[PDB]
């Protein structure tokens, strides 16, 4: 994991993987969405990630 002033960006594309599926488990401390609701992410379609 890089540091805060040289953060690493990975572009995600060409795949249909369940979001909640991954967020289905645990091991997190904060899951805060803005502009969307984390329960409706499997009904949308996006241009890039």
């Amino acid at each position: 994991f890089a540091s805060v002033y040289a953060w690493n960006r990975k572009r995600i594309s060409n795949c249909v993987a369940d979001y909640s599926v991954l967020y289905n488990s645990a091991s997190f401390s904060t899951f805060k969405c803005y502009g969307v609701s984390p329960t409706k992410l499997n009904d949308l379609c996006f241009t890039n990630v």
């Binding site: 289905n24 645990a26 609701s37 984390p38 329960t39």
Partner: protein, 46 residues
């Protein structure tokens, strides 16, 4: 209506009016039209 139980220390913010979460989406829900208080206090000494 006093609902009394015990949870993990993390999802204490999961008992709230209107939310999404493993605990809130499967084991206990409150309506968005909630009216009442929520009290939580720690327990590993009992």
């Amino acid at each position: 209506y006093a609902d009394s139980f015990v949870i993990r220390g993390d999802e204490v913010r999961q008992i709230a009016p209107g939310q999404t979460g493993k605990i809130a989406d499967y084991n206990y829900k409150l309506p968005d039209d909630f009216t009442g208080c929520v009290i939580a206090w720690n327990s590993n000494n009992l």
